[PDB]
C-alpha cells in the first residue's frame, strides 16, 4: 500500500514542480520586459529632449494611443457636440434635454466614453487661440448634481487657462504656472500602476506639469471644461 501513497506524492510534487517552472518563466519575462522598458525610460529622461528626436519616439514606445469619443449623454445642456463626436462648442441658450442621472447639471463638463483600468495611455487635444479652457481626468463616482470644488480630494485632476493670460492647476488652494511660450496643442499622458498624470506641449516637446504619487482605486475618465463663447472649438486629434 505504501507504493500507492508514494505514487500519489510523486504526482502531487510533480505538479508543484510544474507550477514552480511556470512561476520561473513569468519572472524571466517580467525581467526582460523591465530591462527594455528601462532603456526606453532612460532615453526619454536622457535630457530636456525637445528637438522632436525623442518625443514622437518615446511617446510611441512607452504609451499606447487612445481614441477618445464624446458622448452627448453627459454634456451640460449648454454644450454642443459635433456629428463626428470630436469637437465641443458653447451655445447662447441652454437646450431642453432630459435629466438623466449621468448628466452634469451645474458644471460645464463633458466626459468621454471609455474607462481606463490599467495600463499606459495618451491623447492629444487642440486648443488653438482660445482664451479659457480646462482639461484633465476624473473618477467615476464623482458628484454630478450640484456644486463641488474641482479638487483631487474630490476626484478631479485638471489644469488650464483663464483670463487669456493666467495658467493654473486646480488644487486647494490654486497655484500659478509660469510658461515662457504659448501652447497650441496639449498632450495628456496617464500611467495607472505608478500613478502618474502628465501634461506636455506637443509642438516642441517641453514639459508642463505632472501629478505624481496618487493611489487610484476606481476607474478614470477624460474630462473637458469650457466657460466662454468663442468662434474656436476644442478639437480632439484622431489616431
Amino acid at each position: 500500500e505504501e507504493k500507492k501513497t508514494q505514487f500519489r506524492k510523486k504526482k502531487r510534487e510533480q505538479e508543484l514542480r510544474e507550477m514552480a517552472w511556470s512561476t520561473m518563466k513569468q519572472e524571466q519575462s517580467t525581467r526582460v520586459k523591465l530591462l527594455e522598458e528601462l532603456r526606453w525610460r532612460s532615453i526619454q529622461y536622457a535630457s530636456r529632449g525637445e528637438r522632436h528626436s525623442a518625443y514622437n519616439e518615446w511617446k510611441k514606445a512607452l504609451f499606447k494611443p487612445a481614441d477618445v469619443i464624446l458622448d452627448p449623454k453627459t454634456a451640460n445642456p449648454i454644450l454642443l457636440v459635433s456629428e463626428d463626436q470630436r469637437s465641443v462648442q458653447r451655445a447662447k441658450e441652454p437646450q431642453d434635454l432630459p435629466d438623466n442621472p449621468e448628466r452634469f447639471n451645474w458644471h460645464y463638463c463633458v466626459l468621454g466614453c471609455e474607462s481606463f483600468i490599467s495600463g499606459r495611455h495618451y491623447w492629444e487635444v487642440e486648443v488653438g487661440d482660445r482664451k479659457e479652457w480646462h482639461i484633465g481626468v476624473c473618477s467615476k463616482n464623482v458628484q454630478r448634481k450640484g456644486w463641488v470644488k474641482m479638487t483631487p480630494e474630490n476626484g478631479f485632476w485638471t489644469m488650464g487657462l483663464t483670463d487669456g493670460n493666467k495658467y493654473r492647476t486646480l488644487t486647494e488652494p490654486r497655484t500659478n504656472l509660469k510658461l515662457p511660450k504659448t501652447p497650441k496643442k496639449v498632450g495628456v499622458f496617464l500611467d495607472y500602476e505608478t500613478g502618474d498624470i502628465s501634461f506636455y506641449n506637443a509642438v516642441d516637446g517641453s514639459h508642463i506639469h505632472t501629478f505624481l504619487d496618487v493611489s487610484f482605486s476606481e476607474a478614470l475618465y477624460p474630462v473637458f471644461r469650457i466657460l466662454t463663447l468663442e468662434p474656436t472649438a476644442l478639437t480632439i486629434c484622431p489616431a
Binding site: 435629466d99 451645474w106 450640484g146 456644486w147 463641488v148 470644488k149
Partner: protein
Amino acid sequence: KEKKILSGEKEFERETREIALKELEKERVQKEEELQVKEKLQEELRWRRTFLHAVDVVLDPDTAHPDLFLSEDRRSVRRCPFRHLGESVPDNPERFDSQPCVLGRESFASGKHYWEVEVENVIEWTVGVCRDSVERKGEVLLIPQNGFWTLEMHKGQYRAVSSPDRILPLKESLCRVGVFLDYEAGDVSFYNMRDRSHIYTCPRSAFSVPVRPFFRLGCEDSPIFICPALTGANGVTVPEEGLTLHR
C-alpha cells in the same frame, strides 16, 4: 403507500408556485403605475425649479438680545438704552447674550431667494446669512468658518466678511441693500437696489444645513426697516371706478 402519499403534495407545491407567480405579477403592475405618477411629479419639479422667489421676513423674538426693541409688526428694531428697568427676559438656549443680533424665522434649504433692507440714517449695522447651528451664548466671531456671511459698515467704511484688509471702494452712501442666496451653488451676494448694481459675492462654500437671515445693530436709538413683499390688493375692496393711491 409511501410513494403515493409523498407524491400527494406535488399539487400543493404547484399551488405555492402559482400564488407566488401571481403575486409577482400584481407587484410588477402596481410598481409600474407608481413609477409613472412619480415621473409626472419629477417633470413638474424640473420645470418649476428655475425660478427666483421674493420673500418677506418676520423677526423671531426668541433669539433677540435682551436690549432690542421690536415693533408690533416685527419688521423693525432699535437698540434701547437699558430698557430693563423692571423687565425680565428669560435665558433660553436660543437667545443671544453678549451680541446684539436678531435672526429671521424661515429656514431655507433649496432654490434662490432675495430680500431688501433699508439702512438709511444708520451708523453701524451688519446684514447677512447664518447657519441655524451657531453658538449663541458668549462672545463669538462672525467669520465664515463659524457660519456667518455678512456685510457691515464700520467707522465710515464698508466691510466684507469682517477681515479689515478688504474694504470696498464704494462711491456713495447705501440706502437700500439687497441680499441674494443660491443654495446649490454656495452663492451669497449683496446688491445695491438703486441701479441694481452688483456689490459683492463671497467665496463659494458648502452649506449642508438650513440657513437663516441675520441682522446686527451697532448704534443707539436708530431703526432698521425690512421692505415687505408686494401684495397687490388683497384684503381690500376694489370699486368699479378702481383703486387709486392706496395707503
